[PDB]
Amino acid sequence: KQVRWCAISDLEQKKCNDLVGSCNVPDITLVCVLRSSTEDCMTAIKDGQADAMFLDSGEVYEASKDPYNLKPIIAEPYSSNRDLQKCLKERQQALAKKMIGHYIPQCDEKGNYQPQQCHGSTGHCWCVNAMGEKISGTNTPPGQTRATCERHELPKCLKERQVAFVPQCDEKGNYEPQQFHGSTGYSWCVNAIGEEIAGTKTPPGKIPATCQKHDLVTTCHYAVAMVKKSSAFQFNQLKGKRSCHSGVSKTDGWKALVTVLVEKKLLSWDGPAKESIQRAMSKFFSVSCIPGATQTNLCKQCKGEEGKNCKNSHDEPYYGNYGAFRCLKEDMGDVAFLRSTALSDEHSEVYELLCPDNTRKPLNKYKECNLGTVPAGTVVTRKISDKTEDINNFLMEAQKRQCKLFSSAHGKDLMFDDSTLQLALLSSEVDAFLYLGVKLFHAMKALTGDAHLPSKNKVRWCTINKLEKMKCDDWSAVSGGAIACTEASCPKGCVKQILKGEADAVKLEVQYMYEALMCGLLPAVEEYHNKDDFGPCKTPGSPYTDFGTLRAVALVKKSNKDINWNNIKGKKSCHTGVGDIAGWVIPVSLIRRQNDNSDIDSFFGESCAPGSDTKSNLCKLCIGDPKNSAANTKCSLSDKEAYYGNQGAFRCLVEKGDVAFVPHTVVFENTDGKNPAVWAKNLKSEDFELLCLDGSRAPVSNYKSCKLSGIPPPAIVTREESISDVVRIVANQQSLYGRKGFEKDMFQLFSSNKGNNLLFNDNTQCLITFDRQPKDIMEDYFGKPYYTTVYGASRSAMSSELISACTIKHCSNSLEVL
Ligand SMILES: NC1=N[C@@]23[C@@H](N1)[C@H](COC(=O)NCCCCCCNC(=O)c1ccc(C(=O)O)c(-c4c5ccc(=O)cc-5oc5cc(O)ccc45)c1)N=C(N)N2CCC3(O)O
Numbered sequence: 001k002q003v004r005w006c007a008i009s010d011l012e013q014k015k016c017n018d019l020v021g022s023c024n025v026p027d028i029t030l031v032c033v034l035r036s037s038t039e040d041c042m043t044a045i046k047d048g049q050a051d052a053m054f055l056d057s058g059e060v061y062e063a064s065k066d067p068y069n070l071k072p073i074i075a076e077p078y079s080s081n082r083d084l085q086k087c088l089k090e091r092q093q094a095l096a097k098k099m100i101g102h103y104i105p106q107c108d109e110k111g112n113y114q115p116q117q118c119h120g121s122t123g124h125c126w127c128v129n130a131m132g133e134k135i136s137g138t139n140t141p142p143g144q145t146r147a148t149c150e151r152h153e154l155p156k157c158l159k160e161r162q163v164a165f166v167p168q169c170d171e172k173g174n175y176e177p178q179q180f181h182g183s184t185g186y187s188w189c190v191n192a193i194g195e196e197i198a199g200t201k202t203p204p205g206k207i208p209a210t211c212q213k214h215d216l217v218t219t220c221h222y223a224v225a226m227v228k229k230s231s232a233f234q235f236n237q238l239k240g241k242r243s244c245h246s247g248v249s250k251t252d253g254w255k256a257l258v259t260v261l262v263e264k265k266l267l268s269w270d271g272p273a274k275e276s277i278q279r280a281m282s283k284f285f286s287v288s289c290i291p292g293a294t295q296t297n298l299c300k301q302c303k304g305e306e307g308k309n310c311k312n313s314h315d316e317p318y319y320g321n322y323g324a325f326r327c328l329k330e331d332m333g334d335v336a337f338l339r340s341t342a343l344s345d346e347h348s349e350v351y352e353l354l355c356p357d358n359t360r361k362p363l364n365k366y367k368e369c370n371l372g373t374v375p376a377g378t379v380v381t382r383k384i385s386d387k388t389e390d391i392n393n394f395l396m397e398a399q400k401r402q403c404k405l406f407s408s409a410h411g412k413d414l415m416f417d418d419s420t421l422q423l424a425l426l427s428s429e430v431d432a433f434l435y436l437g438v439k440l441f442h443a444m445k446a447l448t449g450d451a452h453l454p455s456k457n458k459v460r461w462c463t464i465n466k467l468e469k470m471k472c473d474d475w476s477a478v479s480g481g482a483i484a485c486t487e488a489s490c491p492k493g494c495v496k497q498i499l500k501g502e503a504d505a506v507k508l509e510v511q512y513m514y515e516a517l518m519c520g521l522l523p524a525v526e527e528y529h530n531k532d533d534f535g536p537c538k539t540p541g542s543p544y545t546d547f548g549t550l551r552a553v554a555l556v557k558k559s560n561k562d563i564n565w566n567n568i569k570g571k572k573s574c575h576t577g578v579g580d581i582a583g584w585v586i587p588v589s590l591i592r593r594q595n596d597n598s599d600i601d602s603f604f605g606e607s608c609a610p611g612s613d614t615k616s617n618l619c620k621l622c623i624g625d626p627k628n629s630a631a632n633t634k635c636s637l638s639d640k641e642a643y644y645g646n647q648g649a650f651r652c653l654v655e656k657g658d659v660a661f662v663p664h665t666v667v668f669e670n671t672d673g674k675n676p677a678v679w680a681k682n683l684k685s686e687d688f689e690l691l692c693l694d695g696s697r698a699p700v701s702n703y704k705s706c707k708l709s710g711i712p713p714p715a716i717v718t719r720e721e722s723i724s725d726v727v728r729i730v731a732n733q734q735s736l737y738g739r740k741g742f743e744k745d746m747f748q749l750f751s752s753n754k755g756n757n758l759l760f761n762d763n764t765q766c767l768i769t770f771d772r773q774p775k776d777i778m779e780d781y782f783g784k785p786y787y788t789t790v791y792g793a794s795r796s797a798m799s800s801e802l803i804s805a806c807t808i809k810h811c812s813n814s815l816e817v818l
Contacts, residue, residue, distance in 0.1 A: 001027065001028065001029065001390070002028070002029050002031060002390070003028055003029070003030055003031065003051050003052070003387065003390050003391050003394045004030075004031040004032075004033050004049070004050045004051040004052075005030060005031070005032055005033065005050065005051065005052060005053065005415070006033045006034075006035055006041035006044050006045060006049075006050035006051075006052075006053045007032055007033065007034050007035065007041070007415070008035055008036070008037055008038050008040070008041050008053075008312065008313045008314070009313040009314035009315045009319075009414075010034075010314070010315060011314045011408075011410045011411040011414055012314060012414045012415055013032055013034050014408075014410045015408040015410050015411070015414045015415055016030070016032035016415060017032055018404070018408070018410075019398075019403060019404065019405070019415075020032060022403065022404065023398050023401065023403035023404075023405075024401070025393075025394050025397040025398060025401070026397070028390060028393060028394045028397070030394065033049060033050040035050075036308075036311060036313060036315070037292070037311045037312045037313050038053075038055070038059070038247075038249070038292070038312040038313070039292075039312065041053050042055075042063060042068045042070060043067070043068065045068075045070060045380075045381065045382060046067065046068050046069060046070065046382065048382075051381060051387045051390070051391055052073070052074075052379050052380065052381045052387065052391045053379070053380060054377055054378070054379050054380075054415060054416050054417075055070075055072075055377055055378060055379075055380050056247070056249065056250040056251060056252075056377045057251055057374065057375040057376065057377055057378070057435075057436065058249060058250050058251035058252075058254070058255045058444070059249045059250065060072055060378065060380070060432045060435055060436060060444075061432050061436065061441065061444035061445065061448060062249065062444075062448060063380055063432065064383070064431060064432035064433075069382070069383050070380040070381065070382060070383060071380060071381065071382070071383040071385065071430075071431055071432065072378035072379070072380045072426060072430060072431075072432065072435045073378070073379060073380060073381050073385065073388045073391065073392070073425070073426055073430075074378065074379035074391065074392060074395060074423050074424070074425055074426060075376060075377075075378040075379070075423070075424065075426050075435070076376045076377075076378075076417075076420050076421065076422060076423055076424070077422065077424045078217045078218070078219065078376070078809075079131070079217065079218050079219070079815070080215045080216060080217045080218075080809075080815075081131075081174060081192065081215065081216040081217075081815055082172075082174070082215055082796075082799075083131070084172065085111050086113075086131060086132060087105055087107040087111055087112055087113045087132060088107055088111045090105050090132065091104055091105045091106070091107055093422075096400050097399075097400055097402065098400055098401050098402065099402050100121075101120075101121035102121065103117075103119045103120075103121075104120075105117060105132065106118070112130065112153070113128050113129070113130060113131070113132045114128075115127055115128060115149035115150065115151055115152075116128070116146070116149040117132075117134075122141075122142070123141065123142025123143075124139060124140065124141055124142065125139075125140055125146055125147075126138045126139040126140065126147070127147055127148075127149035127150070128149070129152040129153065129815070129816060129818070130152065130153035130818075131815045133814050133815055133816055135147075135149070135152070135816075152818065154173075154818065155169070155172075155173035155174065155818055156175070156193060156194060156817065156818050157169035157173050157174060157175045157194065158173045159818070160194065165181050165182075165183065166182065167179060167194065168180070168793075170794045170795070170796035170797075171792065171794065171796065171797075172796065174192075174796060175190050175191070175192065175193065175194045175214075176190075176794065176795060176796070177189055177190060177211035177212060177213050177214060177795055178190075178208065178211040178776055178795070179196075180776075184204075185203070185204030185205075186201060186202065186203065186204065187200075187201075187202050187208035187209070187776075188200045188201040188202070188209070188211075189209060189211035189212070190211075190214075191214060191810060192214035192215060192216040192808075192810040193216060193810075193812075193817050197211075202774075204774070205774050206774055207772055207773075207774045208774065208775065208776065210520055210522075210720075210777055212520065212806070212807070212808055213518065213795055213803070213806065213807040213808065214807065214808050214810050215804075215807050215808070215809055215810065216810050216812055216815060216817075217809050217810065217811060217812070218811075218812055218813065218814055218815060220373050220809075220811035220812075221252075221339055221340050221341060221373070221374045221376070221419070222252075222339070222340045222366055222367070222370035222371070222372065222373055222374060223251060223252040223253075223256035223257070223337065223338075223339060223370055223371040223372050223373075223374050224252075224337075224338065224339070224340055224343070224353055224354075224366050224369065224370045224371065225257070225335050225336070225337055225353065225354040225355075225371065226325070226328060226335065226336045226338065226342075226343075226351050226352075226353060226354070226363075227328075227334065227335050227336075227351065227352060227353070227354045227360070228328065228350060228351055228352075229350065229351065229352050231334055233334070234354070234358040234359065234360070235264075235354055235355060235356050235357070235358045236264065236266060236358050238261075238266065238284070238285070238335065239266065239284055239285075240285070240286050241285060241286065241333075241334040241335060242285065242286055242287055242288060242301060242332065242333040242334045242335075243285045243288040243289075243290070243333050243334065243335050243336075243337065244288070244289055244301065244318060244323075244324040244325075244327030244328050244332065244333035244335070244336040244337070245257075245288065245289065245290040245291070245324055245336075245337050246291070246319070246320050246321050246323065246324045246337065246338050246339070247290070247291045247292055247312055247319060247320070248278070248290045248291060248292035248293045248298075248312070249292055249312065251372075251374050251375075252321065252337065252338055252339035252371075252374045253290070253321075253324065253337045253338060254290070254337070255444070255447060256337075256371035256372040256374070257337050257371055258277055258281075258447065259371075259372065259443070259447070260356050260371050260372070261284070264356065266284075267280055267281070267284055268280060268283065268284075272446075272447070272448065272449030272451075273449060277447070278293060278294055278295050278298065279295065281293075281295070281298060282295035282297050282298055285297070285298070287300040287301050288300070288301055288333065289301035289302035289303075289310065289316075289318045289324075289327050289332060289333065290310070291310055291311060291312050291313070291316050291318070291319040291320075291323070292310070292311070292312040293310060298310075301318070301327065301332040301333055302316055302318050303316070303317045303318055303332075304316035304317065304318070304319075314411060314414070318332075320412075320413050321338040321339050321341060321342040321413065322338075322342055322412050322413065324336040324337065324338045324342075325338060325342050325347075328351070335354055337371075339374055340366045340370070341413075341417065341418070341419045343363045343366060344363075345363075345364075347363060348362060348363050348364070351363065353365060353366060353369040353370075354369075355368075355369035355370075356371065367811075367813075373809075373811055375436070375440070376417070376420070377416075377417055378426075378435060379391070379395070379416075379423065383431075385428065388428075392425050395423055396425075399422065399423065405420075405423075406418055406419075406420045406421070427801050429801050430801055432444075433496065433499075433500055433805065434496075434801050434802065434804075434805045435805075436805075437804075437805045437806070437807075437809075438499050438500075438519065438805055438806055441500065441805075442500075442501065445500075445501070451501070452501040452502070454501075454721070454722075456725050457481070457482065457725075457729075458481060458482060458483070458484055458504075459482065459483055459484070459504045459505055459718075459722075459725070459726055459729050459730075460484045460485070460486050460502075460503045460504040460505075461475070461483060461484070461485055461486070461503070461504070461505060461506065461759070462485075462486045462487075462488050462493075462494035462497050462498065462503040462504075462505075462506040463485060463486070463487055463488065463494075463759070464488055464489065464490055464491060464493070464494065467752075467754050467755035467758050468755075468758045468759055469485060469487055470752075470754040470755075470758075471752045471754050471755070471758040471759055472485035472759060473485060474747060474752070474754070475733075475737070475747060475749075475759075478737070478743075478746055478747045479733060482729050482732065482733060483729075483733065486502060486503045488503075491506065491508050491509070491512045492512065492515070492802065494506040494508075495508070495512070495515065495516050495519065495521065495717075495802070496802065498521060498717075498718065498719060499519055499521070499719075499806070504718055504719075504722055504726065505524055505716055505717065505718035505722070505726050506716065506717065506718075507527070507714055507715070507716045507717075507759065507760055508714065508715055508716075508717055509714050510581055510711060510712050510714070510715075510782075511579070511581060511585075513712070513715055513717070513781060513782070514778075514791065514797075514798055515798070515800060515802050515803055516715075516717055517777050517778055517781060518795065518798075518803050518806055519802065519803070519805075519806035520719070520720065520806065521717045521718065521719060521720075522717060522718070522719075522720055522723055522770070522772075522777065523715035523716070523717050523770045523781055524715075524716050524717055524718045524722075524723055524726040524727055524730070524769075524770060525715070525716045525726070525727060525730050525767040525768060525769055525770060526547070526713045526714070526715050526716065526767065526768050526770055527548075527713050527714045527715075527716075527760060527761060527764040527765075527767060528544070528547060528548060528713070528764065528765045528766050528767065528768050529547065529548020529549065529713065529761075529763060529764060529765060530544070530545075530546050530547060530548040530765060531548065531763070531765060533545065533546070534739075534740070534765065534766075536766070536768055537738070537739070537740070537765055537766035537768075538740065540731070540769070544768065546704075547713055547768075548713070548765070549710055549711055549712065549713055550581075550582060550663040550664065550665065550710075550711045551582075551663065551664045551703045551704065551707040551708075551709075551710055551711070552581065552582035552583075552586040552587070552661065552662075552663060552664075552707060552708040552709050552710075552711060553582075553661075553662065553663070553664050553690045553691070553703055553706070553707050553708055554568075554587070554659050554660070554661055554690065554691035554708060555650075555653060555659065555660045555662055555666075555667055555688055555689075555690060555691075555700070556653075556658065556659045556660075556688065556689055556690075556691055556697075557653070557658075557687065557688055557689075558686075558687050558688060558689055559687075560658055563658050563659055563691065564691060564695045564696070564697070565691050565692065565693060565694075565695050566695045568591075568604075568659060568691075569595070569603055569604070570603075570604065570605045571604060571605060571658045571659060572604065572605050572606050572607060572608075572621065572656065572657050572658045572659075573587075573604050573607040573608075573609075573657060573658065573659050573660070573661065574607070574608050574609075574643065574649040574650075574652035574653045574657040574659070574660040574661070574662075575587075575607065575608065575609035575610070575649055575660075575661050576610075576644070576645055576646055576648065576649045576661070576662060577609065577610045577611050577637055577644055577645065578609055578610065578611030578612055578637065579611065579637075581711050582661065582662060582663045582708075582711060583609075583649060583661050583662065584609060584611075584661070585790060586661070586708045586709045586711075586789065586790070587661040587708060588600050589789050589790045590708060590709075590789060591603055593789065600618070601613075601616055601617060601618060602617065604617065604618070605617065606620035606621050607620070608620065608621050608622040608635075608643045608649075608652045608656075608657065609635075610622065610635050610636060610637050610638075610641045610643060610644040610648070611635065611636075611637040612635055613635075614634060614635050618635075619634060619635035621652075621656045621657075622634050622635055622641060622642075622643045622652070623642050623643065623655075624636060624640065624641045624642060624643075625640050625641070625642060626642060628640075646662055646663065646665070646666040646669070647666060647669070647670055647676075649661070649662050649666070650662060650666045650667070650669075650670050650680070651670075651679055651680070654679060654680065654683065655679065659691065661708070663711075664690075664700070664703035664707070667685050667688055667700045668685055668700070670683065671683045671684050671685040671687070671688070672684060672685050685700050685701075686700075688700050690702060690703060690706045690707070691706070692705075692706035692707075693708070709785050709786055709789055710783055710785060710786060711786070712781055712782055712783060712786060714760075714761065715770070715781065716730070716760075716767065727769045727770075730767055730769075731769075733749070734749065734766060734767060737749040738750075738766055739765065739766065750762055750763075750764045750765075778791070778793075778795070779793075
């Protein structure tokens with residue numbers, strides 16, 4: 001009902017009051033809370049005095065910690081080579097605007113961009129590629145011969161696959177990060193456009209380099225140092241010069257400059273714990289104006305009146321990018337540190353750029369003459385996110401109603417960056433770490449002084465609940481300084497903690513490994529489940545035969561001799577539940593491979609898969625809880641469904657089903673003599689068979705050959721630099737706390753009075769070290785069957801916020817490179 005925006009200056013207050021007066025959003029009233037600086041506004045948000053503000057990207061990290069605890073919620077989206085169905089989305093966005101006579105993009109029936117795009121209000125037309133980028137020069141006004149538009153959509157990867165080393169592309173035609181040459185055994189990493197990254201080519205038999213994912217994005221901004229052409233100094237002569245800065249906490253005014261200076265060995269500085277950055281900067285420059293600074297000389301060149309001087313606020317006339325430009329223009333500094341948004345061609349006669357290679361270049365060369373790329377600022381609120389919905393609704397309705405959000409007659413860059421075109425809602429999972437990305441988050445953490453000093457003799461294990469926390473505390477009290485404990489809420493949280501340097505290693509099931517392998521984490525050890533061969537556990541190096549890995553199989557009855565793999569369409573099937581690997585991952589992936597229609601909702605007849613749509617075919621004949629008529633527990637992803645789990649799917653097969661997609665074990669767990677006493681009392685394993693991929697049948701004991709696929713073992717993973725430091729300690733803690741260890745009467749690693757299946761699965765025999773083979777990490781872990789079946793041997797099969805945070809953003813002037 002109400003949204004309070006915090007303004008840091010008088011001009012922002014005027015713009016916010018103008019928006020309150022002019023922008024009319026139904027059921028939401030805007031309120032303008034005035035503060036004197038950016039930090040005061042962050043504090044007012046922390047105290048519940050305000051609701052949301054806009055922060056520079058560099059200010060995000062310090063915003064996620066005491067005494068602020070804020071999180072980014074609303075950010076400007078960028079265009080990339082990963083945007084699928086961009087035309088339909090942009091047309092829907094344009095049609096949602098309460099305005100007449102604007103450009104609504106035109107798509108075809110399939111949903112792609114029509115090669116010719118016209119602006120109906122003006123009559124102008126132009127040509128456009130697959131991503132909607134205007135072909136240069138094709139803009140024609142009405143009454144003039146139109147430019148004939150061609151069809152430019154064939155990506156570079158598929159075009160290089162033709163006329164042919166054969167590159168590997170994904171399902172969308174993008175370059176896979178890892179390229180493997182078939183003629184000569186070589187592996188390397190490539191750019192988002194296919195350019196080979198240096199230092200990644202590896203001969204055969206050698207472990208390939210881990211390739212990182214790349215996304216090609218456009219409309220990037222940079223941190224630049226502007227100077228006047230009348231001056232003559234270069235970059236390595238900034239010592240003792242007068243400097244103008246946009247702000248002490250902004251990337252384009254401080255952080256990028258600090259990074260470049262410390263890498264070029266120009267700034268005499270010890271460390272964040274030994275000396276503050278501001279002291280080294282005060283000793284570096286002579287007199288400067290750096291808004292928000294705490295050293296007097298770094299505030300001498302500012303023009304703010306008494307009580308307004310050197311504040312992170314437009315009350316200081318030298319604050320911001322345009323403030324730093326005015327600082328340079330009025331001859332109070334020799335170099336301004338700002339963002340490429342403040343550049344213009346009207347300044348290309350008096351001003352130029354100061355590049356870190358000790359040369360000067362004109363402004364238009366800012367892509368080759370900068371201090372680094374600057375990510376877009378974001379609208380942040382309290383981490384508890386008690387107002388995110390109202391703020392989002394207000395901003396979205398203000399954008400749809402064409403309110404003056406990103407411009408003002410009172411000034412520039414007020415409330416938001418003027419360069420902003422559109423604000424979108426971020427996923428609730430996005431914190432400062434997910435917003436900045438792994439590398440940039442670690443850079444901010446090291447710059448602020450929170451960089452963890454790694455210890456090569458202590459492993460920080462990450463837990464997912466209080467029971468695992470208790471077991472880990474036992475292990476830490478009994479380990480003698482070798483094991484410490486961190487707490488998280490889920491395995492993905494532990495992966496995030498490891499990527500942030502807050503933890504060291506954690507155990508993950510297979511369904512969590514993909515993202516973990518996408519972010520550069522390597523499997524340190526793996527659980528061994530062979531309960532009949534202790535050989536590999538008693539002495540390392542013993543060649544293991546079976547790792548105890550489960551094998552997904554399609555179990556049928558000997559009675560029905562008409563169910564083969566090539567006629568499972570329309571048959572009644574049973575699943576353990578939506579999400580399970582052997583129950584609803586291997587079979588659905590296989591079916592989606594062979595049947596190009598790709599519709600499991602209509603593939604089977606009346607299948608029973610707990611967790612699907614209660615009205616769909618995947619939820620029929622599921623008897624949910626026999627003696628509970630006061631509730632409707634059909635298709636429940638819990639034990640309230642009698643056909644849930646391995647035993648539940650086996651009962652579904654026994655009672656009403658034809659085939660069950662289950663691990664190979666349940667057949668022996670509910671037949672023979674080892675069986676329950678309800679529906680499997682006189683059942684035998686010799687009355688069932690397994691369906692093989694070639695369309696034949698096999699006995700149940702033939703699961704090592706007649707199987708759908710194999711499941712990789714749960715992997716205990718860590719970072720690369722910690723690999724050699726983890727495994728050792730594991731061994732050191734296994735021979736003491738394993739199943740046949742020296743101190744197994746003090747703590748058993750694979751059992752606990754605190755709970756079942758804590759830290760590791762309680763049926764684990766031991767932890768075998770990962771033998772790194774010279775092939776792809778994804779392949780080496782999953783197995784080429786599993787890889788090619790589930791993820792199609794592609795790094796683009798899944799997309800999440802964590803994967804985006806582990807992706808390099810390759811800037812480019814356009815996506816026209818195809
Ligand atoms: N670094 C590393 N990696 C392994 C390994 N150590 C351990 C697991 O080792 C064990 O536990 N012992 C069992 C194997 C010991 C060797 C016995 C001879 N077997 C193979 O050499 C073999 C290995 C992997 C695969 C695979 O599936 O890719 C296949 C295999 C095929 C290869 C090409 C092809 O067209 C078809 C294939 O078809 C299959 C069909 C099947 O039906 C069943 C298996 C295959 C064959 N843990 C991991 N997480 N790893 C990750 C990947 C990995 O497996 O290499």
